[PDB]
């Protein structure tokens, strides 16, 4: 969760295992930034606004 | 540091990463089909290679589950999909050639040569056999066309059946089951649910139940054939006997679509067909799709989203670009749906696209659902809604609001018998084979059939139970349950089995609510909000609840109805009673090509 009226920083790389990554990449989880695949056939709700 | 704590977040995160890769596979299908590039050909294969096998790597920690109750959501049902391990139980050396042997006969069947006398011209199974199906009145050609195909390859198909059953059953043994048929019942399996639980083996018995309503349909047609087909083929058609399967428009008798030639009502009255009378408003390729769009408001189905206008082609390419005649529509979601034919100015575009119409409108009803549960009440629901309204798309009396009817209604029977019998040809010829094939798989899966009664009984039961004749029986020299792609690749008919009768009930649901009595060809489905309200519930309910609850709601009766099947063609069946009341009913099992 985020607090109201404050800006979000997305830096931490999440790991599925609750043990810390400790600077080592893990499996089954990746960088939490999602690049939405934008096709012209997407619905208006799916379309970015 | 709990593994359950890991899995709780991991499962939620996985469903979104999965969808991005799942969506890409269907998109490359058309792009590869129009220009083949190195990137284009590999897109679907490398996209889907991280779905099935890679699932196990994410699924390893799904076996640590506990009698924890916190899972009460439909999640438990996706959780079973998270518990799948795949074919990892199989050894690599025994599965190395399993893929090779599985598709070996598919190449031979596709690359098959039919021997012809004097080798006048090249011949092929499809469409060469269907092209000259009724070109001449030679029994010898009809026999030899299939006899040569069998004598080409069918003897060598026997070794295909050895490892197939063992490997198929080994999945059940690895999955703490004795039979794989009980593993196929995962969509029909529900547990820890009060009064809404169904058993996997119960769906075993319907084969006996479903054939009670099949014989009445076959009996009425046989009386009609008895009148007319003796003159054309008197050497192999006896009135008190089984209707021959080697004189119809089929190589194996599966689809009895080409029965109009042998069952034409009158040879002096041509059927009504208007083509030039319809073109007075400059009929073009766009006219058919415009009328299809107008069909939407007469069925209350909403118009499909922007995907209708870009992914679907509605005109000829006009260039050297080659298009796919086979429709390609997938439930990707997010507005990606297709209606694709070999789009030209053709009358077939009227019907084939309509077949996809039900396949379109259903998907947006549960597209918002996760891909793991992106389906209807059962597997046959997807293919059921696409054909129920297709019957109304060919009747022009239901097309009063089309503007092309000129409703000078003919004097009922006199005309309708000519047209309606054609539609009867759809409902008669596919029941027996679907009935007989589905039985064989279930008995062979458990293994209670002995080897001495596993091969010969395939033809022994055929003469007595269904009542059909074959051109050449196969005892221990041809493997009849090895000549089909479905058998050679471990496919079943559960896709066509549940909806076979339920489609008629679905179509009757649109009229029973509307308080319509009589034959179902004069039902008005226009501007009806009662039917749309009923149709908009279970379309969007999806798979969230157990299918048992939805089964009671959708049909309203726990048993099967036979009067709706006989009520759409009431004049057709009634008229044959007068001319056949003073005759022997049924067929005699004594006479058959057993010897
Ligand atoms: C050899 C071949 O397939 N060429 C096609 C070309 O006909 C088509 O116009 C183009 C799409 O713009 O894709 C490529
Ligand atoms: C008269 C005829 O044969 N065909 C059509 C008719 O059905 C239609 O109503 C009219 C304009 O709507 O155009 C013409
Ligand atoms: C339908 O029944 C009527 C009743 O007399 C009959 O005149 C007509 O010939 C019948 N139609 C056919 C196609 O047999
Ligand atoms: C539906 O058809 C027209 C709407 O165009 C309307 O006049 C009619 O009353 C409606 N109901 C029936 C049963 O036709």
XYZ file of C-alpha atoms and ligand atoms in Angstrom:
700
model
C 0.000 0.000 0.000
C 0.923 3.650 -0.507
C 0.162 6.648 1.656
C -2.139 9.418 0.383
C -0.586 12.305 -1.557
C 2.943 10.908 -1.730
C 5.031 9.666 -4.635
C 5.976 6.051 -5.280
C 9.514 4.829 -5.941
C 9.769 1.424 -7.634
C 13.338 0.227 -7.052
C 13.203 -2.968 -4.984
C 13.324 -6.224 -6.930
C 10.761 -8.543 -5.374
C 11.462 -12.228 -4.762
C 8.740 -14.829 -4.293
C 10.689 -16.479 -1.491
C 10.449 -14.437 1.687
C 14.216 -14.738 2.095
C 15.939 -11.573 0.824
C 17.457 -11.598 -2.647
C 20.763 -10.335 -1.175
C 21.752 -8.854 -4.526
C 21.088 -12.144 -6.348
C 18.329 -12.518 -8.921
C 15.609 -15.057 -8.201
C 13.106 -17.280 -9.959
C 9.337 -16.977 -10.490
C 9.496 -13.207 -9.930
C 10.920 -10.382 -12.024
C 11.253 -6.598 -12.023
C 7.921 -5.109 -10.863
C 7.674 -2.616 -13.754
C 5.121 -3.842 -16.300
C 5.257 -2.754 -19.943
C 1.670 -3.069 -21.139
C 1.453 -4.618 -24.586
C -0.672 -2.094 -26.469
C -2.528 -3.514 -29.457
C -5.057 -1.405 -31.399
C -7.638 -4.155 -30.737
C -7.627 -3.448 -26.986
C -10.829 -2.267 -25.366
C -11.232 1.272 -24.090
C -10.793 0.076 -20.516
C -7.589 -1.663 -21.587
C -6.509 1.407 -23.560
C -4.210 3.777 -21.640
C -5.658 7.157 -20.683
C 9.517 -17.511 5.950
C 6.501 -19.756 5.436
C 6.202 -21.427 2.039
C 2.448 -20.797 2.185
C 3.267 -17.109 2.657
C 5.390 -17.336 -0.491
C 2.704 -19.167 -2.473
C -0.104 -16.786 -1.487
C 1.574 -13.836 -3.216
C 3.247 -15.952 -5.916
C -0.056 -17.350 -7.203
C -1.571 -13.873 -7.485
C 1.515 -12.526 -9.258
C 1.653 -15.478 -11.665
C -1.760 -14.950 -13.282
C -0.724 -11.558 -14.682
C 2.697 -12.597 -15.976
C 1.003 -15.585 -17.629
C -1.523 -13.533 -19.613
C 1.046 -11.410 -21.460
C 2.738 -14.500 -22.900
C -0.562 -16.341 -23.428
C -1.974 -13.495 -25.530
C 0.931 -13.414 -27.991
C 0.527 -16.942 -29.376
C -2.707 -16.376 -31.310
C -1.623 -13.011 -32.750
C 1.234 -14.513 -34.782
C -1.139 -17.025 -36.407
C -2.387 -14.659 -39.113
C 0.932 -12.843 -39.567
C 2.743 -16.129 -40.220
C -0.117 -17.214 -42.491
C 0.418 -14.219 -44.808
C 4.227 -13.904 -44.826
C 6.605 -16.418 -43.250
C 9.637 -14.940 -41.494
C 12.113 -16.485 -39.076
C 10.618 -14.461 -36.218
C 7.063 -15.063 -37.451
C 7.208 -18.863 -37.538
C 8.724 -19.234 -34.040
C 6.491 -16.791 -32.161
C 3.755 -19.217 -31.097
C 6.089 -22.162 -30.450
C 8.521 -20.282 -28.207
C 5.632 -18.386 -26.589
C 3.756 -21.558 -25.612
C 6.915 -23.470 -24.643
C 7.063 -21.488 -21.377
C 3.419 -22.295 -20.535
C 3.082 -26.065 -20.102
C 6.539 -27.403 -19.226
C 7.614 -24.212 -17.439
C 4.432 -24.428 -15.338
C 5.948 -27.255 -13.278
C 8.858 -25.073 -12.136
C 6.320 -22.637 -10.691
C 4.167 -25.566 -9.504
C 6.755 -27.458 -7.433
C 5.752 -25.822 -4.131
C 2.032 -26.524 -4.666
C 2.264 -29.984 -3.053
C 2.919 -28.558 0.441
C -0.785 -27.772 0.962
C -2.502 -28.360 4.288
C -6.001 -28.982 5.680
C -5.943 -25.127 5.983
C -9.495 -23.797 5.448
C -8.699 -20.098 4.564
C -8.934 -21.216 0.895
C -12.735 -21.131 0.303
C -12.613 -19.083 -2.934
C -12.822 -20.446 -6.505
C -9.027 -20.147 -5.962
C -8.992 -23.798 -4.776
C -10.022 -24.653 -8.371
C -7.223 -22.674 -9.978
C -5.017 -24.152 -7.274
C -5.453 -27.591 -8.834
C -4.015 -26.086 -12.025
C -1.170 -24.752 -9.878
C -0.730 -28.328 -8.594
C -0.167 -29.859 -12.044
C 3.275 -31.376 -12.614
C 2.839 -32.545 -16.213
C 4.356 -35.588 -17.899
C 7.504 -35.494 -15.729
C 6.769 -39.079 -14.645
C 7.576 -40.260 -18.177
C 11.101 -41.407 -18.934
C 12.961 -39.550 -21.666
C 13.934 -42.623 -23.701
C 10.398 -44.059 -23.795
C 8.905 -40.649 -24.658
C 11.611 -39.738 -27.186
C 9.803 -41.568 -30.000
C 6.320 -41.294 -28.460
C 5.870 -37.935 -30.176
C 7.367 -39.457 -33.333
C 5.033 -42.461 -33.327
C 1.993 -40.377 -32.336
C 2.040 -38.298 -35.539
C 3.551 -40.913 -37.875
C 0.275 -41.977 -39.500
C -0.922 -38.369 -39.800
C 1.686 -37.732 -42.501
C 0.742 -40.958 -44.298
C -2.957 -40.057 -44.165
C -2.289 -36.540 -45.463
C 0.249 -37.824 -48.018
C -1.921 -40.678 -49.239
C -2.326 -42.060 -52.751
C -5.512 -43.782 -53.924
C -4.817 -46.442 -56.537
C -6.824 -46.056 -59.738
C -7.224 -48.390 -62.735
C -5.043 -47.480 -65.732
C -3.719 -44.510 -63.695
C -5.622 -42.096 -65.928
C -5.279 -39.168 -63.517
C -3.981 -38.398 -60.044
C -6.389 -39.071 -57.178
C -6.453 -38.076 -53.514
C -8.654 -38.787 -50.508
C -9.837 -35.186 -50.119
C -11.488 -33.686 -52.081
C -10.947 -36.220 -54.869
C -13.260 -38.800 -53.306
C -16.011 -36.285 -52.514
C -15.812 -34.712 -55.983
C -16.742 -37.980 -57.723
C -18.891 -39.233 -54.846
C -22.032 -39.194 -57.013
C -20.533 -38.662 -60.475
C -21.533 -42.165 -61.623
C -23.731 -45.030 -60.459
C -20.866 -47.520 -60.136
C -20.866 -49.583 -56.947
C -17.402 -50.883 -57.847
C -15.846 -47.409 -57.675
C -17.577 -46.674 -54.358
C -16.196 -49.890 -52.867
C -12.713 -49.580 -54.357
C -12.177 -45.940 -53.353
C -12.102 -46.900 -49.669
C -10.800 -50.438 -50.248
C -7.611 -49.136 -51.863
C -7.099 -46.566 -49.121
C -7.362 -49.297 -46.502
C -5.113 -51.689 -48.449
C -2.557 -48.873 -48.702
C -1.840 -48.124 -45.040
C -4.485 -49.488 -42.639
C -2.762 -52.834 -42.034
C 0.345 -51.174 -40.562
C -1.605 -49.016 -38.085
C -1.861 -51.906 -35.597
C 1.484 -51.219 -33.799
C 0.242 -47.696 -32.969
C -2.144 -49.107 -30.353
C 0.449 -50.943 -28.237
C 2.201 -48.226 -26.222
C -0.601 -45.656 -26.524
C -2.951 -47.206 -23.958
C -0.134 -48.007 -21.515
C 1.307 -44.488 -21.654
C -2.145 -42.895 -21.404
C -3.016 -44.977 -18.341
C 0.368 -44.288 -16.728
C -0.703 -40.654 -16.301
C -3.514 -41.868 -14.044
C -1.107 -44.055 -12.058
C 1.232 -41.087 -11.599
C -1.853 -39.052 -10.602
C -3.013 -41.525 -7.893
C -5.736 -42.795 -10.247
C -6.424 -46.143 -11.886
C -8.001 -44.849 -15.121
C -7.389 -41.755 -17.236
C -11.098 -41.372 -18.000
C -11.618 -40.389 -14.374
C -8.816 -37.854 -14.842
C -10.708 -36.330 -17.775
C -13.578 -35.573 -15.353
C -11.829 -32.657 -13.637
C -14.307 -30.160 -15.073
C -17.116 -32.387 -13.755
C -15.450 -33.059 -10.381
C -16.573 -31.108 -7.311
C -15.882 -31.950 -3.669
C -16.721 -30.527 -0.225
C -19.789 -28.788 -1.669
C -23.184 -29.513 -0.145
C -25.831 -31.111 -2.396
C -23.974 -29.879 -5.503
C -21.429 -32.694 -5.829
C -21.137 -34.829 -8.961
C -19.327 -38.111 -9.531
C -16.822 -38.808 -12.290
C -18.207 -42.273 -13.073
C -21.828 -41.067 -13.289
C -21.108 -39.456 -16.673
C -20.241 -43.034 -17.663
C -23.872 -44.167 -17.860
C -25.268 -41.545 -20.260
C -24.143 -43.622 -23.263
C -26.914 -46.071 -22.403
C -29.331 -43.226 -21.644
C -28.637 -41.035 -24.682
C -29.396 -43.725 -27.283
C -33.068 -44.040 -26.284
C -33.866 -40.783 -28.116
C -31.680 -41.633 -31.132
C -33.630 -44.600 -32.521
C -36.910 -42.634 -33.022
C -35.057 -40.204 -35.300
C -33.403 -43.009 -37.276
C -36.686 -44.909 -37.659
C -38.582 -42.078 -39.370
C -35.853 -41.514 -41.967
C -35.585 -45.243 -42.704
C -39.285 -45.421 -43.599
C -38.709 -42.550 -46.040
C -35.708 -44.321 -47.593
C -37.722 -47.542 -47.898
C -40.094 -45.796 -50.306
C -37.527 -44.296 -52.665
C -34.128 -46.018 -52.575
C -35.162 -49.537 -53.635
C -35.346 -48.485 -57.293
C -31.926 -46.804 -57.330
C -30.002 -49.546 -55.471
C -32.017 -52.789 -55.287
C -29.019 -55.118 -54.887
C -28.109 -54.006 -51.349
C -31.237 -52.295 -49.935
C -33.873 -54.540 -48.305
C -36.980 -52.808 -46.773
C -36.876 -54.835 -43.504
C -33.203 -54.199 -42.728
C -30.505 -51.720 -41.858
C -30.091 -48.664 -44.050
C -26.862 -49.071 -46.064
C -23.923 -46.888 -45.050
C -21.931 -47.467 -48.271
C -24.346 -45.584 -50.561
C -24.382 -42.216 -48.754
C -22.315 -39.071 -49.230
C -19.510 -40.172 -46.920
C -16.400 -42.332 -47.041
C -17.025 -43.788 -43.568
C -20.647 -42.781 -42.936
C -19.751 -40.268 -40.213
C -21.467 -37.148 -41.594
C -24.688 -37.910 -43.483
C -24.930 -34.443 -45.031
C -25.248 -35.574 -48.668
C -28.593 -37.323 -48.187
C -30.699 -34.855 -50.199
C -30.017 -36.652 -53.491
C -31.318 -39.982 -52.171
C -34.218 -38.384 -50.240
C -35.464 -35.641 -52.582
C -39.253 -35.289 -52.071
C -40.254 -34.676 -55.695
C -38.177 -34.561 -58.874
C -40.753 -32.381 -60.673
C -40.908 -29.472 -58.193
C -37.612 -27.561 -57.871
C -36.833 -25.966 -54.527
C -37.379 -22.234 -54.116
C -34.174 -20.199 -54.395
C -33.913 -16.472 -55.149
C -30.581 -14.899 -56.102
C -31.266 -12.177 -58.690
C -34.474 -11.060 -56.967
C -32.273 -10.323 -53.930
C -29.719 -8.182 -55.837
C -32.025 -5.246 -56.689
C -30.130 -3.077 -54.170
C -26.679 -3.840 -55.651
C -25.766 -6.903 -53.603
C -22.047 -6.835 -52.767
C -19.669 -8.479 -50.301
C -20.542 -5.858 -47.678
C -24.266 -6.658 -47.948
C -23.865 -10.075 -46.315
C -21.984 -8.670 -43.330
C -24.434 -5.760 -43.057
C -27.276 -8.274 -42.861
C -25.253 -10.229 -40.291
C -24.954 -7.036 -38.233
C -28.710 -6.495 -38.578
C -29.113 -10.076 -37.338
C -27.583 -8.945 -34.031
C -30.488 -6.655 -33.128
C -32.962 -9.428 -34.016
C -31.162 -11.755 -31.572
C -30.596 -9.109 -28.825
C -26.856 -9.823 -28.786
C -24.768 -6.645 -28.390
C -22.378 -5.573 -31.112
C -18.802 -6.713 -30.593
C -16.056 -4.225 -29.758
C -13.377 -2.568 -31.910
C -11.761 -5.970 -32.506
C -14.595 -6.549 -34.983
C -13.233 -3.817 -37.254
C -9.457 -4.416 -37.402
C -8.635 -8.067 -36.671
C -11.512 -9.379 -38.816
C -11.340 -8.960 -42.590
C -14.621 -8.055 -44.313
C -13.412 -7.796 -47.926
C -11.176 -9.477 -50.470
C -7.431 -8.838 -50.035
C -7.323 -8.032 -53.756
C -3.576 -8.755 -53.998
C -1.365 -11.835 -54.095
C -1.817 -12.050 -50.321
C -3.188 -15.457 -49.336
C -5.780 -15.761 -46.575
C -6.987 -18.628 -44.390
C -10.363 -20.124 -45.282
C -10.520 -21.856 -41.895
C -11.835 -19.493 -39.189
C -9.350 -18.541 -36.474
C -11.030 -17.081 -33.382
C -9.453 -17.426 -29.948
C -10.526 -16.392 -26.455
C -7.560 -14.148 -25.756
C -9.674 -11.512 -24.022
C -9.014 -7.782 -23.896
C -11.156 -7.248 -26.986
C -9.098 -9.538 -29.246
C -11.578 -11.683 -31.183
C -11.709 -12.607 -34.859
C -14.208 -13.507 -37.545
C -12.137 -14.601 -40.531
C -13.169 -16.468 -43.675
C -11.836 -16.435 -47.216
C -13.828 -13.243 -47.499
C -15.162 -12.618 -51.009
C -18.597 -12.097 -52.587
C -19.750 -15.605 -51.690
C -22.969 -16.975 -50.223
C -21.006 -19.265 -47.877
C -19.810 -16.158 -46.021
C -23.412 -15.848 -44.820
C -23.292 -19.124 -42.905
C -19.701 -19.826 -41.843
C -19.235 -16.447 -40.164
C -22.578 -16.951 -38.424
C -21.122 -20.129 -36.925
C -18.484 -17.956 -35.256
C -21.117 -15.437 -34.119
C -22.087 -17.442 -31.045
C -18.392 -18.093 -30.498
C -17.883 -14.315 -30.384
C -20.657 -13.076 -28.101
C -20.055 -15.798 -25.510
C -16.410 -14.869 -24.970
C -16.910 -11.270 -23.828
C -19.366 -12.674 -21.288
C -16.472 -14.433 -19.516
C -13.427 -12.741 -21.068
C -13.050 -10.766 -17.830
C -12.642 -14.108 -16.058
C -9.088 -15.441 -15.643
C -7.790 -17.575 -18.492
C -7.671 -20.573 -16.142
C -11.486 -20.349 -15.827
C -12.290 -18.693 -19.167
C -15.090 -20.962 -20.393
C -18.760 -21.794 -19.923
C -20.500 -24.251 -17.632
C -18.864 -27.204 -19.409
C -16.634 -27.907 -22.395
C -19.559 -28.288 -24.796
C -21.057 -24.897 -23.952
C -18.569 -23.088 -26.206
C -19.699 -24.954 -29.338
C -23.395 -25.018 -28.380
C -24.342 -21.332 -28.602
C -22.674 -21.052 -32.018
C -25.105 -23.440 -33.724
C -28.447 -22.888 -31.959
C -29.150 -19.614 -33.784
C -27.581 -20.807 -37.054
C -30.784 -22.751 -37.714
C -32.697 -19.456 -37.580
C -30.197 -17.828 -39.969
C -31.287 -19.962 -42.947
C -35.070 -19.802 -42.465
C -36.458 -16.849 -44.472
C -39.814 -16.769 -42.654
C -37.970 -15.715 -39.497
C -36.403 -13.077 -41.789
C -39.551 -10.943 -42.092
C -37.605 -7.878 -40.919
C -34.894 -8.590 -43.503
C -36.894 -6.858 -46.235
C -36.317 -9.700 -48.716
C -39.032 -12.162 -47.652
C -42.155 -10.861 -49.415
C -44.214 -12.816 -46.873
C -46.630 -14.502 -49.272
C -46.606 -17.555 -47.029
C -47.031 -20.859 -48.845
C -49.726 -23.331 -47.796
C -47.656 -24.842 -44.979
C -46.814 -28.573 -45.518
C -46.794 -28.396 -49.327
C -43.660 -26.246 -49.252
C -42.125 -26.808 -45.823
C -41.553 -30.546 -46.289
C -39.204 -29.717 -49.159
C -37.096 -27.375 -47.024
C -37.330 -28.768 -43.487
C -36.194 -32.265 -44.488
C -32.871 -30.701 -45.485
C -32.387 -29.438 -41.935
C -33.402 -32.890 -40.702
C -30.350 -34.154 -42.592
C -28.271 -32.306 -39.986
C -29.874 -33.991 -36.963
C -29.898 -37.654 -38.066
C -26.561 -38.765 -39.489
C -24.176 -37.774 -36.680
C -25.885 -39.371 -33.658
C -24.934 -43.057 -34.232
C -21.178 -42.596 -34.679
C -20.864 -40.165 -31.772
C -22.809 -42.659 -29.662
C -20.729 -45.706 -30.597
C -17.255 -44.140 -30.473
C -17.695 -42.565 -27.030
C -18.614 -45.952 -25.543
C -15.510 -47.718 -26.869
C -13.030 -45.344 -25.220
C -14.548 -45.669 -21.743
C -14.545 -49.483 -21.760
C -11.035 -49.687 -23.191
C -9.678 -47.197 -20.633
C -10.508 -49.388 -17.631
C -9.597 -52.598 -19.462
C -12.548 -54.859 -18.608
C -12.903 -55.801 -22.296
C -10.787 -58.889 -23.081
C -8.341 -58.837 -25.972
C -10.379 -61.501 -27.779
C -13.447 -59.246 -27.446
C -11.626 -55.927 -27.937
C -11.094 -56.131 -31.712
C -13.857 -58.345 -33.135
C -16.542 -56.792 -30.915
C -15.921 -53.478 -32.715
C -17.795 -55.010 -35.652
C -19.872 -57.560 -33.717
C -21.730 -54.848 -31.790
C -22.039 -52.689 -34.910
C -24.437 -55.066 -36.679
C -26.814 -55.485 -33.731
C -26.686 -52.351 -31.571
C -26.606 -49.432 -34.008
C -27.620 -51.371 -37.120
C -25.253 -50.279 -39.894
C -23.415 -52.166 -42.632
C -19.797 -51.807 -43.679
C -18.087 -52.278 -47.054
C -15.285 -54.366 -45.520
C -15.129 -55.604 -41.908
C -11.745 -55.684 -40.180
C -11.103 -58.580 -37.790
C -7.348 -58.919 -37.191
C -5.937 -57.512 -40.450
C -6.960 -53.841 -40.416
C -7.019 -51.725 -37.259
C -10.252 -49.749 -37.595
C -9.671 -47.943 -34.249
C -6.379 -46.679 -35.655
C -7.348 -44.958 -38.938
C -8.527 -41.652 -37.432
C -6.497 -38.664 -36.276
C -8.563 -38.513 -33.078
C -7.552 -42.052 -32.104
C -3.969 -41.566 -33.317
C -3.523 -38.447 -31.138
C -5.621 -39.460 -28.088
C -8.727 -37.368 -28.736
C -12.247 -37.980 -27.441
C -15.731 -36.808 -28.409
C -16.558 -35.166 -25.061
C -16.429 -31.867 -26.973
C -19.412 -32.897 -29.130
C -21.207 -35.102 -26.587
C -22.646 -32.882 -23.845
C -23.965 -30.162 -26.173
C -25.454 -32.610 -28.701
C -28.862 -32.671 -26.996
C -28.399 -29.572 -24.831
C -28.303 -27.310 -27.910
C -31.952 -28.083 -28.671
C -32.857 -27.268 -25.065
C -30.889 -24.018 -25.362
C -32.841 -23.068 -28.486
C -36.120 -24.032 -26.797
C -35.195 -21.821 -23.833
C -35.605 -18.810 -26.135
C -39.201 -19.833 -26.964
C -40.549 -21.442 -23.781
C -39.944 -18.224 -21.841
C -41.514 -16.222 -24.689
C -44.643 -18.438 -24.404
C -44.436 -19.807 -27.945
C -46.299 -23.010 -28.813
C -46.000 -25.362 -31.767
C -43.103 -25.924 -34.144
C -39.947 -23.954 -33.385
C -39.488 -22.622 -36.942
C -42.138 -19.910 -36.408
C -40.639 -18.544 -33.192
C -40.122 -14.761 -33.060
C -36.787 -14.013 -31.270
C -36.962 -10.296 -32.112
C -37.109 -7.375 -29.614
C -37.456 -9.933 -26.799
C -36.043 -8.697 -23.491
C -37.182 -11.783 -21.563
C -34.906 -14.026 -23.634
C -31.980 -11.607 -23.415
C -32.297 -11.337 -19.636
C -32.174 -15.128 -19.304
C -29.267 -15.368 -21.758
C -27.272 -12.702 -19.906
C -27.057 -14.612 -16.605
C -25.138 -17.841 -17.235
C -23.124 -16.202 -20.004
C -21.448 -14.013 -17.370
C -21.630 -16.413 -14.402
C -18.925 -18.571 -15.966
C -17.083 -21.187 -13.927
C -17.194 -19.404 -10.552
C -19.784 -21.811 -9.125
C -19.817 -25.609 -9.466
C -21.285 -26.768 -12.763
C -23.905 -28.844 -10.918
C -25.763 -25.716 -9.776
C -25.693 -24.232 -13.281
C -26.886 -27.505 -14.836
C -30.173 -27.386 -12.916
C -30.722 -23.720 -13.786
C -29.918 -23.874 -17.500
C -32.309 -26.660 -18.523
C -34.685 -26.754 -15.559
C -35.101 -30.547 -15.757
C -32.692 -33.216 -14.524
C -33.752 -35.524 -17.389
C -33.564 -35.262 -21.170
C -36.456 -34.053 -23.323
C -37.381 -35.751 -26.594
C -40.465 -33.755 -27.686
C -38.460 -30.604 -28.621
C -36.463 -32.708 -31.091
C -39.644 -34.041 -32.727
C -41.562 -30.741 -32.553
C -39.404 -28.693 -34.940
C -40.102 -31.231 -37.714
C -43.615 -32.264 -36.660
C -45.130 -32.303 -40.197
C -42.148 -34.282 -41.502
C -42.542 -37.110 -38.988
C -46.355 -37.041 -39.050
C -46.605 -37.365 -42.839
C -44.595 -40.608 -42.840
C -47.037 -42.258 -40.414
C -49.882 -42.422 -42.947
C -47.843 -44.167 -45.658
C -45.956 -46.502 -43.286
C -48.587 -47.449 -40.687
C -49.333 -50.675 -42.600
C -45.735 -51.879 -42.689
C -43.134 -53.673 -40.599
C -41.460 -51.366 -38.069
C -37.730 -51.351 -37.394
C -35.110 -53.634 -38.897
C -34.245 -57.315 -38.553
C -30.818 -58.164 -37.131
C -30.857 -61.572 -38.852
C -30.005 -60.065 -42.251
C -26.586 -58.394 -42.319
C -23.220 -58.829 -44.081
C -21.959 -60.927 -41.173
C -21.169 -63.833 -43.508
C 6.442 -13.636 -50.384
C 5.434 -13.013 -49.464
O 4.785 -13.680 -48.664
N 5.285 -11.689 -49.569
C 4.353 -10.930 -48.751
C 3.678 -9.838 -49.577
O 2.927 -10.436 -50.628
C 2.764 -8.996 -48.698
O 2.253 -7.896 -49.442
C 3.527 -8.469 -47.484
C 2.649 -7.718 -46.510
O 2.687 -6.318 -46.754
O 4.109 -9.564 -46.759
C 5.056 -10.315 -47.537
C -39.234 -6.419 -53.821
C -38.182 -7.498 -53.764
O -38.305 -8.537 -54.404
N -37.098 -7.286 -52.986
C -36.774 -6.125 -52.154
C -37.774 -5.944 -51.005
O -37.786 -7.111 -50.191
C -37.413 -4.722 -50.169
O -38.437 -4.466 -49.215
C -37.238 -3.495 -51.063
C -36.802 -2.263 -50.304
O -36.817 -2.483 -48.900
O -36.232 -3.753 -52.055
C -36.603 -4.814 -52.950
C -49.188 -31.842 -46.228
O -50.513 -32.202 -45.821
C -51.531 -31.733 -46.718
C -52.861 -32.091 -46.096
O -53.826 -32.416 -47.088
C -51.330 -32.354 -48.098
O -52.299 -31.822 -48.994
C -49.927 -32.056 -48.613
O -49.699 -32.752 -49.833
C -48.878 -32.473 -47.585
N -47.547 -32.104 -48.040
C -46.642 -32.996 -48.455
C -45.322 -32.436 -48.890
O -46.879 -34.199 -48.478
C -41.296 -6.751 -31.786
O -41.468 -6.233 -33.167
C -41.913 -4.874 -33.342
C -40.697 -3.986 -33.212
O -40.168 -3.643 -34.486
C -43.023 -4.527 -32.357
O -44.020 -3.762 -33.023
C -43.631 -5.808 -31.809
O -44.757 -5.502 -30.995
C -42.592 -6.549 -30.983
N -43.124 -7.813 -30.490
C -43.516 -8.828 -31.273
C -44.031 -10.041 -30.559
O -43.458 -8.774 -32.499
